[PDB]
Structure formats: C-alpha cells, structure tokens
Design a protein around this ligand. Structure first.
Ligand SMILES: [Mg+2]
Ligand SMILES: [Mg+2]
Ligand SMILES: [Mg+2]
Ligand SMILES: [Mg+2]
Lengths: 222, 125, 204, 195, 222, 233, 196, 212, 195, 196
C-alpha cells in the first residue's frame, strides 16, 4: 500500500528573550539511514518579522510554510499593507493546519518574532493546529532530549535558592541573546551526540525590531 | 433554471413588480390587528359574494405558526400558504436548535426576509 | 502491552572524581494510575550498586536473584563481588533468558575496592553491556535523561557537585515523563562512605 | 441508555426508562429522562447509541409537532409509529444509520384505546401488550407473560412494573439508577414522581 | 554498524565503527565491535549487540578448549564452522552478522557469516547498515597485492564512508591486524575523527540548588 | 494507490565548478527480469537542463510528455522563448515538485524519484531532487535508489561541502560519476552495463553522451575464490 | 541463481553464475556455487545460501564416512543422501540442488533435486531463477554425447543468456569438468561471455 | 486531562489542570483548558487539544453572532447545542472532545452542560471529564454539599484537581480556577501543583502516602 | 470479582470485597466471600479471572497451612506476601498464567504492626497504607489520599471505607452488591456483619 | 499466453498460441489472440481476456473514427491509443498487448505495452506467461531483415518452445503476415510444431 507520509528527521528549537526571539534548527535532512543533504534549511523568514519552521515530513513542512508565506502576502493585499502580528499569524496557522484535520500535515510547527509590545514571542503547534504561546519549545526528532534541558536552563525549573531549604525558587528572568545562543548551541551539540537524525549544521534565525539576522555553526557529520 | 430578473428598477427608482404586489394586497380581503393591555386580537373580512361556502373546511384566514404566534394576511391566498409553511418549519427548527420557541419579532423578521429575497432573485416574482 | 512501560520509572548513574552517583525515581504505577510512591529501584550487594528500571515484577525478581548469586559468591570466594565482575554476572544472567527476557534496563554503579576506580555500566534487556566513563541512563524517560546528561555533565565533578548535576538531570527528565517521578532518591558513593538523599520534586 | 420498558393496560400505556447515563467507568448522570412527548397523547422512549438517541427523538418530535400545527390535529399513535418506522427503515440503509430503539406509547382518542408500539433501529414495528428493548426483555417478557392480564388498572400496571424493576435490580449486572415512569391515557401524559 | 575486512600480502585486517543504537538513539558512542576469538583470530560483528558478543564468546571458549585438547593453534575455519553451525541451528533468531579473520598454521583467512548461517570467502568484505558505503570504497580502491599499510588505510577508509554516510554508524574506527608470523595488534580507537567540541558554557550548579527532604548514611559494611 | 511495474534504478549526479553532471543506466526492469535495454532515463529540456528519472517507467513517459508539452506552452506568445524567457531548471523543477506533491496528496502518486540538473541563466548550478511523496532537497551530490547508498559516499569524497565545488573540475567530476556507475553495476542487481551521462556547463553548454559502458572492471581475483569456507579445490 | 550440469562424451560438466543476493543488493559477486561433496561428485547450489551450504556440509560428511566404510560412493548414492535431507526437511528448506558426478562404470550422471525433495535423473539439468529464461534455448541446443569443447560452449552460451535476463544472476561463469582425467576448474569473465 | 465543574448555592465552580500529552511524553504543563466565550460563558477542554481549541473558539464566534442578530446574550442551552449539533455532524470521523459549557443567564440561572464528541449533551449539577475524572469525582463527591461557601467551593474544586493531578499520570502542571455568578465569571488564579501539593499537604495533613 | 479494597490503620488492616458474582447478563450470586484465611493473623482477598481466583487462593492457603503445621509457627505477613509474589511471578511465564490479583492483610505479632500488601497477577508486590485492584482504585486512591491519616482507629477506618463504598455505589457502572468487610488485628480475623 | 510480433524485410508478422484458461481448465483451445484494430494494424493479446477484448474494441472504434476524419493512422498512433487506455486504467486492467502494423513509409513496426501501460518500440517483441521460457532462444536467433520464410520459422520455433514449457500456452500456432501485398493468415497444428 502507498504510504503518503515520510520522516525527514531534523530537530528545531525556539526561545524568546525580552526584546528578541531565536528560532533554530539543524540543517540535516534524512530518510531512513541515509542523508539526503547536510545543508537543507528548514527555518524561514516569512516577512513581517515572523520566522517559521515546520519539522517532520518535509514535503508537508514546505507546503505549509509556502501557504503561510502566501497568507502573509494576501493579508497585505486585503488589509492595506497592515503588518501581520505574531498572535494573528499563530491563529491563521491554526486554520491552515486544522483545515487538513482528517489528512494532517505531519509537522511540528514553531514560529517566532515579537508581540505587539515588542516582547519576544514563540508559538508552537501540533500537527492539527493546537497552539500555545511559550518562552521555550523544542520540536522534531530530538525534542525529547532538548526540551527538559530548556525547562532547567531557561525557566529554571527544579532550581532553588541555595540555603533556603528548598523553599525559595530561583527567580525567573529574561536571558540575553548571547546566553540564549549558548543554550541553543549546547542543546544541538548534545542532541547531535545522542540522536542519529540530528547533525551536520545548525542555522539560527534571530529576530529583533531591526529585522531578521542569521547565524550558522557546523555540527558533527557522523 | 429560469433566470430572468423580473423585479428590476425603473428610471424613477421604483421596483414595479414589488409595487404591483402591493396592488394585489390592496385587492385582498381586509385584515386588522389590535393589541390590548394583555391580549392581541386579529380580525378578518370574508367577501360575501360566496354563499354555499363550506366553512368547516375552507381555509381559515388566521393561521397558527406555533402555539403562541398567529399570522393573518391580505393578498393572494395561494402565495400566503407558501409563507405560512416556511414560517411553521422555521418555528420548529428554532425550537430544535435554540430549545426555545421563536419571539414574535424573530418569526416576523424571518417571514420578512423570505419576502425580500423574492424581490431580488432571478426567476421569481 | 509494552512490558517496559507498564509501571514506569527511571535510573541514572554518573562518575565523578573518586566517586560515583546513582539515582532513581520512586513511582510505581499501572499505566495512568500511580499506585506507590515508595518503590525504590536501586539495590546494593556489598559495595556494588544495581539500579533496575522496567517491569516491576522483573525488577523485584532480579534483585532477589542477584542477592542470591552474590551471597553464594561471597561464601565461596570469601570476598565481596566487584563491579566489573557483577556486571559480567548481570550480563550472563540476562542472556540466559535470551528468548524470554526479563523486561528491564539494569544499571551498575560502584567503586572497585582494590583499584579505587569508579565504575558504571548499563545493559539492554538481553544482556548487552554498555560501559561508559561518564553516565548511564535507563527507563521510560531515557531520551530526556540522555539530553539532560549530555549537556549538564562534565568530567571530574566533586561528590557534592556531582550530586547537584545528577539530581538536576533526573528531576527535569522525570518531569517531562508521565510515568516517571513521584519522588527521587540519590546515592553518592565514595571509597568507603555512601550518602543517600531523598529529593523534593513535583508530585504530579 | 439500556433499560426501556412499556406496558399497555386497560385504559393507559405505561413507559419506564432507566435514569443512568454511563460513559466508560463513570456514571455521569442518574436522573436522565429518556423520553420525548411527540404529541399530547403520544410518548416515545428511546435507547441505543450515544448522541443518536436524542438527535433522533428530537427530530421525530419536531416533525410531529410540525404536523400538528399544520393540520391543527393530533396524529393517531398508529400513524406516528408508522412515520417513525419509515424513518428508521430509511436510516438503516443510509451512510450512517440511526442506532436507536424506541417504544411508542399513545392513547388513541378516536378509539379510546391505549397502544404500545415497539420499533428497533432496523425499522421493525410490532404492537404489544408489553415491550422492552435490550437485555431488559430477557427478564421481563417471561415475568409479564405470567403476571400480566389485559384488563388491569393503571394501578395494577404500576405494581407489575415494580415487579419488573425489582427483578432487573436483582439480576442485571449494571446499576441503571432506577427508572422514570410515565403514564399515557385519555388525559394525556403525566410522570409518576416517587418510584 | 559498519564492519570491514581486507586481506594483504602477509595477513588480514579487520575494522569497525564504534556506534551502538537503540532506534534513533545512540546508546554507546565507543563500543568495541572487534572481538577476540583466540589470540590470532578476531571477529568483527554487526547485528544484535548481545548476540554478536555471546556467540563470539561461546565459540571463543570452545576454541580455547579445543586448542588445549589438540595441542595446536586454533584455525579460522574451525571458528567459521562452529559459528555457522550454531547460527544455522538457531534459524536466524540469533542476529549475529560476523566478519571472521585470522592467521593460523594454514595461512591467513577472511570470511563473513550471515545470521542464517551462510558463509562467504573474499579478499575484501563488509557487513552492517553501513556496508554499502564501505563496499563502495572497497570496490573503488581495492587491488590485488596490498601492503599492510595499504590495507589498514583501505579498511579504515571503508569504515569512514560508513561513519559519515550511514546514520547507523559513527564515532571512531577500531582496527585489528593479523599478520603471519607476528602477534595480532589490536588498534582500539585507531581513528577518533568525532571528538566533541568544547561546550559553550559550564552547567555546574551552585551547591544547595537541589531541594532535599532526607539524608542518611548507608551501611555497606558487615 | 499504485505499484511500479517497469522500473529504472539509480540516477546519480553532482555539481562541479562550472556546472553539473548527471548519469543513469539504460535499463527498464520488470521485477527481476532485465526486460528492456535501450531505455533513456535522462531527458533534456532545452539546452540548460536535464531531468533524470528513476522508478516506474510508464509514469516516467508521462513526465516526458509533460516536459515536452511544457516547452511548447512556454513558446506561445513569447518572443523571448529562446532568450530571457527560456525555461530555467528552477522553473522545470518547481513544476514537477508541484505535480509530484499534488499526486501524492490525491493518493495516486507518480511512482518516481527525480533529479533536475542544470545551469541557471546567471550561471549558477542547479541540482535538486523530488520524489513520489513530493519530498525535495538539494545537495552538492544527489542520487536515487542504490545510488544514494553507494554513489553518494564516493561522490562526497570529491565534493563533501559547498566550498569544494569551485575546486572540482569537469574531468575529476566525470571520473567520479563514471566510477560510481561501475560500482553500482558490481553491486546493484537491477543495473545494466550501458548508461547515458550528461554534462551541463555554463561555458560549453549541454553535452549528452549516449551508449557509454562500464569498463576497467576487476574480476580476475574471482579465479582464486573456491568454496565457501573449507573447500580447497 | 543460474546453474546447470551437462553429461557429455567423457563425463560431466557443472556450470554456475557467481551472484549472491539479498533483495537487489549483491552481497557477493564472486560466489562459488559449485561445491565438492566428494573427489568426483559435485553439486550446484541454488536457493537459500545458508540452507544449501548446511546441506552440502552434511552430505560431504556422510560421503566421507561412507567412503571410510564401503569405498567410493556412486553418484546415485550421493543424490539419495541429498534427497533424504531435502525431502524430510522440506518444510524448513529452500534448496534447489543439482548433483553431478563421474564413475568409471557409469560415466557422467546428473540428478536434479527441486524444492519438494524429489529426484530426477537427466542427461542435463538447469535450475535456479535464471533457468526459466533458457528452457527454450537449452532444449533446442542440447545433444547427447557432445565433446568437452561443445559442452563448455553449450554451458557458456546458456548461462550467458540466463545471466542476461535474470537480474538475480551475474558475475563470472564458473564451471567444473568431471572426467576420468581428473577435475578441472574453468572460469569465464563478463567481457568474454556478455557479447556472445 | 482532568477538568470539573459543579453548581452550588453560590453559583458555579470550574477547575481544570493544564497538562498536555503525546503518549507518555509530557508536551506542556501550561495549557489553557478553559476558554472564556463571553463574560458570562465558559467552556472546558478535554480530549484532542486541537479539536477542543478550534471548535470552542469557533463556538465563541457563533455565540457572538447570536447576540448581534438577536440583541441578547445566548443561552447556555443554545450555546451547548450549537457545539453538540456541530460535533454530531462529524460523528464517526474521529473527533475527540469532552467539554463542559458553563454559564449564567437570567432565564436559566447558573447552568452546566456536558457535551462530548459522540454527540452526548447533558444538563447537570456536577461533572468531571478527562483521564483523571474518576480521581476528581472521588474527592468532589465525598465533600460536596449544595451549601458550600464560595470559599469552600473554590477550594474543593482546586483540591479535586490536585487529587487527580497527583494520581493520574496524564494530569498535572497547574490548576486554573473560575467562579461563575449572576454577575459573570471571575478568574481565581493559576496554581502550580509544584507548590500547591506541598502547601496542601502541610496545611491539611493529607497525602500521607507521600514521603513528606 | 471486580472490587477489592484494603486500608491499614493504627492497629489493624481492613479488607473490603464485593459480593457479586456475575456471568453474562446474570448476577448469579450476591453473597460471595472473596477471601481466604491463610493463617490466624493473615487474610488474602482476591479478584480476577473466573476459576483461577479461588484455585489460586486455596492453593496458597494449603501451602501456608502446611508450613504452619510443619514448623508449629505462623509465618509473618511479609513472609507470606513474598511466597505469594513468587508464586505469581513464576505463574506469569507459565503455559497458562494465573490471572489473579490479591491484597494480603496481616497483623505481625512480632512487630505488633498491621501490614497491607498489594500484589497483581504479574507478581508486582508493594506495601501500602491503602490499596485496591481493578477500576476501584481510580475512585478510592484519590479519596483516601485526602481523608486518610496514619493513626486512625479501626472505627475511623470503617467510616473511611464507608466513604469509599458510597462513592463506588454512586459512580461505578456495575452493581457489585455491597461488600463483606473483615478486620485483621492482634486478636486475629473477624467479619463485620452489618455493612 | 505465448505471443510475439517480429519485423522483417517486407513488413511484420504476429504470432500467438490459441489457449484460453481458467486455472488449469482450458476454456478455449482454439482462441484467436491476433486481433485487427485496422486493415494493417493488428495486436497480440495477453492477460485478462475480458480486459484485452474491451480494449481492442475501444481502439478499433477510435481508429475507425480517426480514419474517417484524418485517413490511415500510423502504427505509432495505434500504439498510443492502446497506451492511453492501459496507462490511465492501470489499476483495473490486466493487459499485456503487442501492437504491430505496416505503413508504406515506415514498413513493419512493433510496439509492446506491458502491465503499467508504458510503450516500447522494438524490432521484435515477446509477451505472455510463455514468453519467459524463450527470452534465451529469441535473443540468440533473431536477426534484422529476415525473409518472410525465416521469420515464419523463427516464430514457429519460438512459440513451439513457449508452448512446450508453459502449461498455460497451447493449441494451434496462429500467425498474421503484414506486408504491402496485403494480409495473410497462417495456422500451424500440433503435429507439425511439437516435434521441431
Ligand atoms: Mg553516520
Ligand atoms: Mg499526574
Ligand atoms: Mg478488473
Ligand atoms: Mg503446453
């Protein structure tokens, strides 16, 4: 029987600062035990200061990103070049996904940018459109390796104030872009060590009120 | 299907077919409604050029739409049957979906909407 | 109907400077229903520590079996079994049930009493020995533990530091797993003292 | 759903319907009325697939209420039961059939006779002195075969019903949380409040 | 796994990668896939890790007893025969795929064994998930009349093809050289081309971070 | 829902400094039967693109018709059909990729793996892959089927990353490809000896070589191989 | 597999391709499918490599023991030992074997043992997946009492065709000649046989 | 999930956990399972996250359209029936929803409707829904009285979710509390089980099964 | 089978076990005692596959009674529970396993402490303040998590049990026909006759 | 089925056996598998009898209509119409068809259309279950530009062998000759071809 889905591996990661947000993902693309490409980017600038990644089955991911990019274009045409806010983008993507509820896009989706007060924002979606705003989210093959690390190092979960008798929590606070990138780089190298589908290269898109910047780092190629 | 725009504007801004519909109403037997402090009464003329009428069975002029709302009319009797049936169907559908019978205003607004629709749909008068 | 994830639970071991640490959660459930918050997964035979995740009946059975075998070992050999040797015994015993295995992910931790070396090892259900310098993980939250350990870990941690690292690896892995948590226990193990600490963690 | 019973006596039809609504291992409700008044002298009880039951019952009710308003006349129980049967008989060959079984209890004002109809989801209609749907029948039909007489009073029918419910409470594996009992006679429909 | 074997002038060389997997997860980054059967007969193994280890040890044990009994250095064809007949008896259910090589009074030998019990003979062989990447290299660069230094290079190149291109293989290259008239040399971690880069940050925690409920000293003594 | 009947095996390809090479054998298999031996699976489109196709041949012939019809349609009311408005490799690819994904979404795929190789009007090398699932990806080397398992590792020793492409000449690249085709003939039981190779160079244009053969094969060592273990003679 | 054995004037010749396959991957392109179970009793192997090796090893052992006790076994005897193994274990074996040997009384003999473990004595035999494609060719071109050179040509041309059409078959053509003179191994490479 | 809603003397309590799972993977601990449809209408979510989320915000749109067309806030009965009639259309297609439509209107008083994806719609005083529903019921039923003070009511709802968060592996994260009165709904905060469990254990002296 | 519960209080273990035996759509019995006295201070309740339950219970009982006679000594609850666990742990890999879950309530006379052990058919043993097998746990564990204190009297434990049974009677789908309650303390085993 | 079509000096010849089978029962031992879709464009049918008849009837209709509007269709055109039907309905058809015709410009042409509905222009073509057994024979014996008599012998010998080994094939050997001279039907009975 024809199976209309496949699995292209990779893993992605979004983090939100006070006045920035990063969306990262590895550049390896796989099927089964073969490497298709060591550099196939899956994190895209969609305009209006929104970056997006749809990870899992790449055909579905590309189709979604294409449709959303197109949705931005028409939003301008129909609403007098109004800037599409990240919250509005998120809701639009829900309808894109849920519209194929009974033949889903096999992707975990993450978008990042700034909310309307200029604060860093990350939204993540399940394959059929359930979405949630978060400070922190990993998606894809190594989500399960990276996510609890982020709970610990980004939201300081399970960390208490020394000498307080486990009574006072380590206090929540925003991270600098420099710290956030260290956590991303360490997240992906750790994931690369222990997950066969993760490797080759790491491409990060950083988003501030000044636009979208990129950074790229090599990963282990085995 | 038959498509012709029968209800159209004339140069003076009148829709003649709608206005001629009013003429058919004006020829119709008289109907009156008066509302009291605590009741509403609907009265209706029946033209008296008809004896040998069987009044047991001849369609009465005040129709129940639901158990709490009535409708009477003046104009073409055959046309009125179409509106009454539609109204009755909507009344049951409203009870089914909203779990409440129609307000008089709602039922009125529905019947009005049906009437209006027939003034800008092709193929109908 | 996947025996290794009916009961839930996790075990992690870690080497530091002249010490090892081994830790586990306390949950025993029947799928969604948590049943006991007192189900420890770490046992010791002399100075050799064994943690076992997986199907709880097999966990109990293997503990009872390895107590049995290490007791006879001691009586005949007139000395306590060492970690390197116990590891081999664990492997032999699991592979002996090659076509009807115990559904477990055992982990061995200890310090060789002659050489003073810290030693850890893990096994698949069928006896394969996975030896490591750094850390071993096991259980329903093994992916999470792998991710925690691979980033948190650094070599040559001092006992009190290693405690923080291994505890934070376990706690955050457990909280991303439905079937693990409900309490934790951490063993810090040096040449000749062993400290056992019960961690405070979220109880959902 | 599960338990719905009906007994036709001298001058009335009595319908008894279990109050429990059960999903999984939880009794979500213990006061569910598994019935719809179709007309002032016609009552329909129902049981079957969740959702389908009420959707069907209410759809029938809407149709019968529509008929009443249009003709300013109450359809006879026999006429209603035939309408209902045909709806189910259509349904059984649809894409997704209504999995609902019904009892229809009515008082025919023209005949001055009570009438009980048992119809299953396939559209199998039958008029009966007493009826049941589901596993209830396996206990009550034999009990009623014994204790039932055609000329019983409404009071005697209720006691006969008490016998049936007591037997079901003894031997049925599931707690159905008692029954709501309703009487259809010349004066319409009323609910017995303490059963 | 990727494993290989290559004959040369005066002996035979085998090599293997060092990755062990449980699905997409890397369980062991530096596991030893070269198994000693006797001092001068070594086995490279792919398949079920426990099975390759167990079957290699059992036959290795019986070979030692045989060698003692016969007052002779053991031969490769004996290890080959014992391994094949064991694997065949188990009808494939013992998932051991082996490249058996060594030197003995008869000469130098190179064979492979499939889990169902069939055996090969050749001058160059490869097995495991990465065997096609390996065999591509061997088919490109192998020639009749290799020096020891050429065969080692060819073997480790073949393993590298697997490390880089097969997701089932990675980490390091182990080699073992069996030359006539000399001791076998086991070159554990002959190549280490996948050393983890420095982490960006140290995650050593402030002491007292972890909330504790109870302590107690554990009695390990009598 | 489908099952492929007459199939073509690997299509292999790589970028070099001035262009791209692509190759594919001339066999149409029918299960294990090597049924047809004059099958061309590299289909040139214009003089700047070659589309290499593996998988079901009946679906490949369909795609031939689509591409040949595409050229026709582009010429319509287009005075710059053989200049600025000629079909690019990127246009041809996106078209096929759109079709492949639509067909998989309608649960009726074109049972193929495709590599579009060519040079863009600005001189840039184009090399991208699409298959029956509508999955796409780009890499300095690309191959289908066995090629992915056996050719890619060999071609990647020549071009392992982007920076290697300017350093790779057409002679070196063609050698790697011709070598890869020999390996596949050794090891793939559904390959043939005869193949076609095409080069698309930004200076010399499209060279299309037909009726190539795998040569310089090593077989002599076979005579020394006796039995399967203990047999001596 | 493509395999065959042909009786001729002076004895018998066994022929085979050299391809071992797992699916479409060629695990071995230089396999030896012509196996010695006795000095001048050999067999051609097709089917499961593991099964046919295990069978040949057992048969070799049986005939070695036979020899020690009763002298040189007949080719018929060798074929019977194969049959016994193949017939009695038919549920667990995938083995199509051709048995061929040379007596001095009986000269060249060929026995074929298909899947069910039946035995068939023939002037020549073809088997393996590749054989289907040369039933036509072989039936038309085989004669009785051919010379050694004619027989070598018959096998070379036949297997060349089997290899041409069967993707499962390929590599070198190996042959083993069995006469009073002794035992001769022949090999023919692709560049010779492909363009016959 | 665990969610509950109950009626009492002082209106309606609504409490929900905040965990979302993909099998045994804990996907999120911070999921909003109550949707505020209007100042007098709440909806709870359990089952498929997307299904509930999508169709309950859709329900909000349909309720808004009702008050534009009828110049009157929609009844709880009518709101719940829009959703139940919607999911009934999709019956068999695989929607997964266990929901409760909770609200006050003048004509109805405080009202709770249970609506699920196989088309069941029930009016009632008490319901718990989700994989932890049984655990919630056990606590809720044994301490429920119609007369509870707003304060006791709020705590019982909070304590009932906590109980399910503890025992049900697939419930947890935090408790979200609501009180619905004649004047509309009032939020009563997010309560992390992380701290709520230990605080309740200490102050109440319950949860003795747990190593303190 | 279905409902078996256990609570360990200050000076006793209390076991409550449902009385219904149900086969098909018939409650065959409403007074079934789902328990065996293993020794004078050890009681085992059981639930699971029909036939297996009693066969297992009685087999364990025979073994423990044999041990008592041989050694003229009563095995401790911990010792009995381990014997039982091992028997089930053997059974799970047999040709046909015992599909029986048990609670073992005993008073250890040497420790002067009551002890409750919960063991499932796989041989999964756990000591508990309170336990249940089957769907009962899904309601009672959370209820007991709330209302249970470690120093309760036997009287308080019974009231706590009354809470559990009332909840099960409210929310359980099936009629299990009440429970037989038994107390294991320093003075042995006795049955509470009106519950 | 065993069927084939062969181009030669003066045109093309189509050959076929005459066996229609339901399992092992021969429903028809005198079938005609050589079917006219136009004066000098014929086809050989193999696979489902119902499918290939329904296809040929449709093609004949299409070419009759083609002729009325545009004159004599080319053999390539006829093969395309077959392909279109076979390709577009691949899920519901079991049809292996060989198309063969004679133009005056193009002389003899042969197109084969296997199961998937691909098209292959060849000097000659063999198909049907029986064809497997003569790939070897036909590849070795076919030459280009044979005479009419040589071609008739090539087909007679080839199909004789296909029929010999394929139980599904049998009966008479029918042939159709397509030249500038016209259309000639040949038949050869068992007693002639069996002992070739
Ligand atoms: Mg690799
Ligand atoms: Mg929980
Ligand atoms: Mg058909
Ligand atoms: Mg025949």
């Amino acid at each position: 029987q024809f199976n209309p889905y496949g699995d292209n591996g990779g893993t992605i990661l979004g983090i939100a600062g006070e006045d920035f947000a990063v969306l990262a993902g590895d550049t390896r693309n796989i099927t089964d035990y073969s490497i298709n490409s060591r550099y196939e980017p899956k994190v895209f600038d969609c305009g209006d200061n929104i970056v997006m990644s749809a990870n899992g089955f790449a055909a579905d991911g590309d189709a979604l990103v294409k449709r959303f990019k197109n949705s931005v274009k028409w939003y301008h045409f129909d609403h007098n070049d109004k800037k599409l806010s990240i919250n509005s983008a998120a809701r639009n993507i829900q309808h894109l996904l849920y519209g194929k509820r009974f033949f889903p896009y096999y992707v975990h989706t993450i978008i990042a940018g700034l909310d309307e007060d200029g604060k860093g924002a990350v939204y993540s979606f399940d394959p059929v459109g359930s979405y949630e705003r978060e400070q922190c989210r990993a998606g894809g093959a190594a989500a399960s390796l990276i996510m609890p690390f982020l709970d610990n190092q980004v939201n300081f979960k399970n960390q208490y104030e020394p000498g307080t008798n486990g009574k006072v929590k380590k206090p929540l606070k925003y991270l600098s872009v420099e710290e956030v990138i260290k956590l991303v780089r360490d997240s992906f190298t750790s994931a690369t060590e222990r997950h066969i589908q993760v490797g080759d290269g790491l491409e990060i898109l950083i988003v501030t009120k000044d636009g979208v910047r990129k950074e790229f780092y090599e990963l282990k190629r085995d | 299907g038959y498509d012709r725009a029968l209800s159209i504007f004339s140069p003076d801004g009148h829709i003649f077919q709608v206005e001629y519909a009013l003429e058919a109403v004006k020829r119709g037997t008289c109907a009156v409604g008066v509302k009291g402090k605590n009741c509403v009464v609907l009265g209706c003329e029946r033209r008296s050029t008809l004896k040998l009428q069987d009044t047991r069975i001849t369609p009465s002029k005040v129709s129940k739409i639901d158990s709490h709302v009535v409708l009477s009319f003046s104009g073409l009797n055959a046309d009125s049957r179409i509106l009454i049936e539609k109204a009755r169907v909507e009344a049951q559908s409203h009870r089914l979906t909203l779990e409440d019978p129609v307000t008089v205003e709602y039922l009125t607004r529905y019947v009005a909407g049906v009437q209006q629709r027939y003034t800008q749909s092709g193929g109908v008068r | 109907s996947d025996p290794s994830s009916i009961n839930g639970g996790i075990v992690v071991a870690m080497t530091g400077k002249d010490c090892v640490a081994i830790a586990c959660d306390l949950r025993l459930g029947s799928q969604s229903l948590g049943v006991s918050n007192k189900f420890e997964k770490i046992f010791h035979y002399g100075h050799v520590f064994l943690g076992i995740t997986g199907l709880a009946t097999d966990v109990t059975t293997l503990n009872e079996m390895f107590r049995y075998k290490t007791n006879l070992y001691k009586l005949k050999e007139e000395r306590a079994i060492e970690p390197e040797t116990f590891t081999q015994l664990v492997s032999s015993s699991l592979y002996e049930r090659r076509f009807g295995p115990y559904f477990v992910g055992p982990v061995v931790a200890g310090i060789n009493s002659k050489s003073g070396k810290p030693f850890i090892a893990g096994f698949d259900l069928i006896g394969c020995i996975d030896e490591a310098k750094d850390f071993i993980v096991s259980g329903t939250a093994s992916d999470q533990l792998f991710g925690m350990c691979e980033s948190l870990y650094e070599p040559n941690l001092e006992p009190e530091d290693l405690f923080e690292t291994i505890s934070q690896a376990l706690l955050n892995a457990a909280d991303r797993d439905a079937l693990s948590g409900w309490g934790a226990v951490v063993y810090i193990i040096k040449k000749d003292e062993v400290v056992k600490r019960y961690l405070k963690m979220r109880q959902d | 759903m599960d338990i719905i019973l009906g007994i036709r006596v001298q001058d009335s039809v009595i319908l008894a319907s279990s109050k429990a609504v059960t999903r999984g291992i939880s009794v979500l409700k213990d006061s569910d009325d598994k019935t719809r008044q179709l007309s002032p002298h016609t009552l329909m009880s129902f049981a079957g697939e969740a959702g389908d039951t009420v959707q069907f019952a209410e759809y029938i009710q809407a149709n019968i209420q529509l008929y009443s308003i249009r003709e300013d006349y109450e359809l006879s129980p026999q006429a209603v039961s035939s309408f209902v049967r045909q709806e189910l008989a259509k349904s059984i060959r649809s894409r997704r059939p209504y999995q609902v079984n019904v009892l229809i209890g009515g008082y025919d004002k023209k005949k001055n006779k009570p009438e009980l109809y048992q119809i299953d989801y396939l559209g199998t209609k039958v008029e009966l002195p007493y009826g049941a749907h589901g596993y209830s029948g396996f206990y009550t039909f034999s009990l009623l075969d014994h204790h039932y007489r055609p000329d019983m009073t409404t009071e005697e029918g209720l006691d006969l019903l008490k016998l049936c419910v007591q037997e079901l409470e003894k031997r049925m594996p599931m707690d159905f949380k008692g029954v709501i009992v309703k009487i259809v006679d010349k004066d319409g429909i009323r609910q017995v409040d303490d059963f | 796994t990727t494993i290989v074997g290559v004959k040369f002038n005066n002996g035979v060389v085998i090599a293997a990668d060092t990755r062990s997997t449980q699905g997409p997860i890397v369980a062991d980054k530096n596991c030893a896939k070269l198994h000693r059967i006797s001092p001068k007969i070594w086995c490279a193994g792919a398949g079920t890790a426990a099975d390759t280890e167990a079957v290699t040890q059992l036959i290795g044990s019986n070979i030692e007893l045989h060698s003692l009994y016969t007052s002779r250095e053991p031969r490769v064809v004996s290890a080959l025969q014992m391994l094949k007949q064991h694997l065949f008896k188990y009808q494939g259910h013992i998932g051991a795929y082996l490249i058996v090589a060594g030197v003995d009074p008869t000469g130098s030998h190179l064979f492979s064994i499939h889990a169902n019990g069939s055996t090969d003979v050749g001058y160059y062989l490869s097995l495991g998930s990465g065997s096609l990447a390996a065999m591509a290299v061997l088919e490109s660069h192998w020639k009749q009349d290799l020096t020891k230094e050429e065969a080692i290079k060819l073997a480790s190149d073949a393993i590298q093809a697997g490390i880089w291109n097969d997701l089932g293989s990675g980490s390091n290259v182990d080699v073992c050289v069996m030359e006539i008239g000399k001791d076998a040399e086991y070159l554990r971690n002959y190549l280490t081309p996948n050393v983890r880069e420095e982490k960006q940050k140290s995650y050593k925690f402030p002491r007292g971070t972890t909330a504790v409920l109870k302590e107690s000293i554990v009695n390990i003594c009598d | 829902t489908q099952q492929p009947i007459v199939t073509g095996t690997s299509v292999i390809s790589m970028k070099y400094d001035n262009g791209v090479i692509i190759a594919a054998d001339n066999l149409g298999s029918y299960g294990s039967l090597l049924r047809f031996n004059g099958v061309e699976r590299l289909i040139p489109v214009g003089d700047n693109t070659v589309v290499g196709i593996s998988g079901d041949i009946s679906d490949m012939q369909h795609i031939e018709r689509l591409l040949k019809d595409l050229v026709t349609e582009n010429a319509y009311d287009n005075p710059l059909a053989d200049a600025e408005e000629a079909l690019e490799p990127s246009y041809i690819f996106e078209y096929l990729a759109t079709v492949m994904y639509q067909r998989r979404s309608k649960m009726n795929p074109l049972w193929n793996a495709i590599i579009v190789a060519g040079v863009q009007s600005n001189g840039d090398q184009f090399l991208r892959y699409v298959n029956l699932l509508g999955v796409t990806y780009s890499s300095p080397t690309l191959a289908t089927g066995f090629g992915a398992h056996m050719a890619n590792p060999l071609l990647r020793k020549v071009v392992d990353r982007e920076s290697d492409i300017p350093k790779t000449t057409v002679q070196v690249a063609e050698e790697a490809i011709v070598n890869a085709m020999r390996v596949l003939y050794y090891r793939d039981a559904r390959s043939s000896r005869n193949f076609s190779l095409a080069i698309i160079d930004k200076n010399t244009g499209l060279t299309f070589k037909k009726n190539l053969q795998v040569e310089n094969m090593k077989w002599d060592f076979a005579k020394d191989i006796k039995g399967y273990g203990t047999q001596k003679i | 597999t493509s395999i065959m054995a042909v009786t001729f004037k002076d004895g018998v010749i066994l022929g085979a391709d050299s391809r071992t396959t797992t699916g479409a991957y060629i695990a071995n392109r230089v396999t030896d499918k012509l196996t010695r179970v006795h000095d001048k009793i050999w067999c051609c192997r097709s089917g499961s490599a593991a099964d046919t090796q295990a069978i040949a090893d057992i048969v070799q052992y049986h005939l070695e023991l036979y020899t020690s006790q009763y002298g040189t076994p007949s080719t018929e005897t060798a074929a019977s030992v194969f049959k016994e193994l193949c017939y009695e274990n038919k549920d667990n074996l995938t083995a199509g074997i051709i048995v061929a040997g040379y007596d001095d009384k009986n000269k060249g003999e060929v026995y074929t043992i298909p899947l069910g473990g039946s035995v068939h004595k023939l002037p020549y035999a073809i088997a393996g997946s590749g054989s289907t494609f040369i039933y036509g060719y072989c039936d038309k071109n085989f004669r009785e009492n051919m010379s050694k050179e004619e027989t070598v040509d018959f096998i070379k041309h036949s297997l060349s065709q089997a290899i041409k059409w069967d993707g499962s078959s390929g590599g070198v053509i190996r042959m083993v000649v069995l006469t009073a003179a002794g035992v001769e191994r022949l090999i023919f490479y692709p560049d010779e046989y492909e363009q016959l | 999930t665990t969610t509950l809603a109950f009626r009492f003397q002082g209106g309606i309590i609504v409490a929900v956990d905040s965990r979302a799972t993909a099998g045994n993977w804990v996907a999120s601990q911070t999921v909003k399972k109550v949707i505020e449809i209007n100042p007098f209408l709440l909806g709870t979510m359990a089952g498929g996250a997307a299904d509930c989320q999508f169709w309950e915000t859709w329900l909000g749109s349909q309720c808004r359209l009702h008050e534009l067309r009828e110049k009157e806030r929609i009844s709880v009965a009518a709101a719940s029936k829009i959703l139940s009639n919607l999911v009934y259309q999709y019956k068999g297609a695989g929607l997964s929803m266990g929901t409760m439509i909770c609200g006050y209107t003048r004509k109805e008083g405080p009202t709770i409707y249970y609506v699920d994806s196989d088309g069941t719609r029930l009016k009632g005083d008490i319901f718990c829904v989700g994989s932890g529903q049984t655990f919630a019921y056990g606590v809720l039923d044994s301490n429920y009285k119609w007369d509870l003070s707003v304060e006791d009511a709020l705590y019982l709802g909070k304590r009932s979710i906590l109980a399910a968060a503890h025992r049900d592996a697939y419930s947890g994260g935090s408790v979200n509390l609501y009180h619905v009165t004649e004047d509309g709904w009032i939020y009563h905060g997010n309560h992390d089980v992380g701290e709520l469990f230990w605080k309740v254990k200490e102050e109440e002296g319950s949860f003795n099964n747990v190593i303190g």
